[PDB]
């Protein structure tokens, strides 16, 4: 499916290297901590590839989760 929206389409301009912007980054993570694929993030290859690393940094800093409990269900 995945016809809801694309995470890039929501957002405005922003720094994909910025490991500290939590609210923007959170948009690229699923209900769990998992990094959304591109078919969701609607990013490009290079982009996605940068996103991933900066998310990983943010995770090490304690700003973003490595994983999360799934609610409802």
């Amino acid at each position: 499916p995945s016809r809801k929206a694309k995470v890039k389409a929501t957002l405005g301009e922003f720094d994909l290297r910025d490991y500290r912007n939590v609210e923007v980054l959170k948009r690229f993570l699923s209900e769990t901590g998992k990094i959304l694929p591109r078919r969701r993030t609607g990013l490009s290859a290079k982009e996605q590839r940068i996103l991933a690393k900066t998310i990983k940094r943010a995770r090490i800093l304690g700003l973003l989760p490595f994983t999360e409990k799934l609610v409802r269900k």
């Binding site: 490595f66 409990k69 799934l70 609610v71 409802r72 269900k73």
Partner: protein, 117 residues
């Protein structure tokens, strides 16, 4: 002998069994039930039916501690995780929420041959 009244229901569902542990809000067990706790012995513990019974049992035992409401936590994939949840849903306990907590590795530990592929 407590009088707890609000708590957690942990459903642990594997392909061989279902174990429903019910605890106080701090996670300390009150009562627990399983496939084998009801009469079922062999493979039959892995049944959705066995799960329903174990759920209903743990919930009876737990209401005897005066419990009203619970938070459900589901760990594991297995036959009758959902049957357990549903038996809990109308057990005559209010299920305030359900959560899938199933632990999965970031790939640390080599599986038994059964689980590799």
């Amino acid at each position: 002998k407590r009088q707890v009244a609000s708590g957690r229901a942990y459903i642990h569902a594997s392909y061989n069994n279902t174990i429903v542990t019910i605890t106080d809000p701090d996670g300390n067990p009150i009562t627990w039930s399983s496939g084998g706790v009801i009469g079922y012995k062999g493979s039959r513990k892995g049944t959705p039916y066995a799960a329903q019974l174990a759920a209903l049992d743990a919930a009876k035992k737990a209401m005897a501690y005066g419990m009203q409401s619970v938070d459900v936590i589901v760990r594991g994939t297995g036959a009758g995780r959902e049957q357990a949840i549903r038996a809990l849903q109308a057990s005559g306990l209010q299920v305030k929420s359900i959560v899938d907590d199933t632990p999965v590795p970031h790939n640390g530990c080599r599986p038994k041959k059964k689980f590799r592929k």
